[PDB]
Amino acid sequence: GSLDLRARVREELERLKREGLYISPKVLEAPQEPVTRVEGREVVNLASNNYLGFANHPYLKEKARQYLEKWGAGSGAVRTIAGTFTYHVELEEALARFKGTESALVLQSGFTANQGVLGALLKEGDVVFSDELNHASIIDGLRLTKATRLVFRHADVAHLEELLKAHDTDGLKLIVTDGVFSMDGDIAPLDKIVPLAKKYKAVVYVDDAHGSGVLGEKGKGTVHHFGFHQDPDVVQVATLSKAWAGIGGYAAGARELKDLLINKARPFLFSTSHPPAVVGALLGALELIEKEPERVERLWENTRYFKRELARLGYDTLGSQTPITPVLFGEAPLAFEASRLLLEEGVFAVGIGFPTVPRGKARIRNIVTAAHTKEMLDKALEAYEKVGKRLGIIR
Amino acid sequence: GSLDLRARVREELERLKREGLYISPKVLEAPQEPVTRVEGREVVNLASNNYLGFANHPYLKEKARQYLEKWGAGSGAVRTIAGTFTYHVELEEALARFKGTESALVLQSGFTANQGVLGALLKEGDVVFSDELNHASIIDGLRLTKATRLVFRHADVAHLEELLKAHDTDGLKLIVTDGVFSMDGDIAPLDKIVPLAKKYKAVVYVDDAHGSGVLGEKGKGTVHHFGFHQDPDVVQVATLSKAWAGIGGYAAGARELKDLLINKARPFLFSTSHPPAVVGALLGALELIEKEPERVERLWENTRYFKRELARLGYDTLGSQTPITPVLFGEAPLAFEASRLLLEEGVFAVGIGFPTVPRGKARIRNIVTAAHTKEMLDKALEAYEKVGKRLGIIR
Ligand SMILES: *Cc1c(COP(=O)(O)O)cnc(C)c1O
Ligand SMILES: *Cc1c(COP(=O)(O)O)cnc(C)c1O
Ligand code: NA
């Protein structure tokens, strides 16, 4: 007796509801901005990755307008056939210059960039050392390779060295980590990891989705912040969808790497290139961060202020260091309930559970941005005070 | 003694050059249109997926402009956190209505839509029956599941029935096929596959990247063309990047499938939603095909005109039933030589040979579009005449 479509779907949704993991996302009814509309109310938004306030900045929109009008709505092909236009190259040139790498290649997302670059680089016999809290896109990248996969305890460089001591290969050794961990907000210890990689002849792969536009001067990233951006055995991959407020992912490094990716990255070979309006906006984003580098200063001013007041109220921010400021709730239902209560106070910050974070490590991610005002952050803090007291998790 | 980054890149590029697989994409210098510029020359373009001539259409661009101005450059989040806006819902409503399915969900790409839907649906114990010529994105979707994978010979429903007789499960049986196969331009025999699925209590999964906007009334797709659009045990996945001339993929079907994907599809959970200008253009595309359904008629008129003159000259178009028009050259060298010679005549089309198709089945892939004129197709045909005569494959 084989299952029909509705019966498999129904069983899975029922399983998710019993495990307390089932979700009902909200619809935003105004632009992506530090205050927006949810369910018909003005809310302070701490749920987005809009770090630099670019998502609705008029300068990105004007550059997007220009490219849209001139080139059109769609590329109409994959990059390697008839999908590469002058505007793709212009962006790869500007991005390489910004990153201070020899080359940059843009892929259709951060999610697919991880599949493309890890797929292109890795072969049977290779050994990968993954931080246990690596983003899900990296797990999927690695599962499509025939590399041996090992996991080191989160940011635990003593444990990484033990595995480097114990697991040799004539092939590639790849140490893979988020630059900034999506849901934890802490920074990979590259100052220790990169030297450790040179000691054991390993290459380091940094997924810098939450470091790009955040860490380093003018937000050039985690690798740049630790000063390794010219190291040939360091490979950077990052989304253009967070601080840079568009879509796409990039890979940065030697021109030889770019050429291997153009030839081997499956998402690059088999998926349409990005359209004019998206590339125009990203060109605008790189121009704007050059004109207004004070946006990164402002982001970090708001962060230290907001993170300090949350700690002061008695909340566990998991040793987050970046504008990502998590509040642990443990069980997913408490995370959802806290979120619902915050929304009652006009504060939008979304409870997160398994898949996206571990079982019993459910949390609300708060992401502070350059465009938040003190008034907005104080409204959010006041709501975290009231909701925290009502739930008995603080004073 | 392990390999450094430069050494692995160098070895892979060297391998690709020796095996004749190394590629150097061309850069297009004008918009995606039936005539464009490549390498400083005007060409009749038969290399794009721009089936309805939407990629640079002023109606899609004006709708994109309107959404960009109103909503901005970026969504700034994944759909399940703070990335769903009014405009995503507007598109999923109009798309479901257009397809005549209960539900429609947009994902980051056609490529990732296959990973999301196959991942959400499939579990250990399930049995998948794949057409052997299924697109690469389906392979990657299936490799991330624990389903038992079986391959039936291309379009061979006798062979499918043998495997259906031999392999039962208490779980899901999923028959997976392209709707239109990229390489020979043939249509999945759904009129035989779907009855065969009802006989063995299987669900059918159709990747309709090359059927969406092409087959069915107003290009509602292969499944609609065979009349199975309201069947809950038929699941559609398709790119919005080809006929619809933007980016993204959709999943269309049963109302509860959407909700399972929102909760479980990894590409949906872990990749940023698409921005205003992309969604605005796709809204425009669906409105435009409603106002000008004669564009689908024109697409098919141009196809029959192009195929008729090739048959008359003595070329073999491999039984293609779609605007995808392969011209057999046999040996890969002769297919690449013909392609280069067509470009010399100002005609841009894609040579394909071994690896990508079998030994002795090399061809030039042409895609005819609604926006090609008789003048453009006559230029292409005249070049096929000259090149064919010079190579001694025709009179
Ligand atoms: C957000 C994120 C991605 C995916 O970026 P998209 O462009 O949204 O696919 C990948 N890796 C990490 C660590 C991320 O945080
Ligand atoms: C084009 C295509 C895809 C991928 O669509 P993208 O949106 O370009 O990623 C997937 N499957 C098939 C069969 C295709 O033809
Ligand atoms: Na207070």
Numbering used by the authors:
A (entry chain A), B (entry chain D): 2 to 396
Lines quoted from the article behind this entry:
We report a chemo-biocatalytic cascade for the synthesis of substituted pyrroles, driven by the action of an irreversible, thermostable, pyridoxal 5′-phosphate (PLP)-dependent, C–C bond-forming biocatalyst (ThAOS). The ThAOS catalyzes the Claisen-like condensation between various amino acids and acyl-CoA substrates to generate a range of α-aminoketones. Like other members of the AOS family, ThAOS forms a tight homodimer with the PLP cofactor bound at the interface between the two monomers, typical of type IV PLP-binding enzymes. We next characterized ThAOS thermostability, finding it stable at temperatures of up to 80 °C over 3 h.
We predict that Arg366 is involved in similar functions in ThAOS, allowing the biocatalyst to accept the observed broad range of AAs. The acceptance of acyl-CoA substrates ranging from C2–C8 is more difficult to understand since there is a lack of high-resolution structures of bacterial AOS:acyl-CoA complexes. However, the observation that ThAOS can use various acyl-CoAs suggests that the binding site is suitably dynamic to accommodate a broad range of acyl chains.
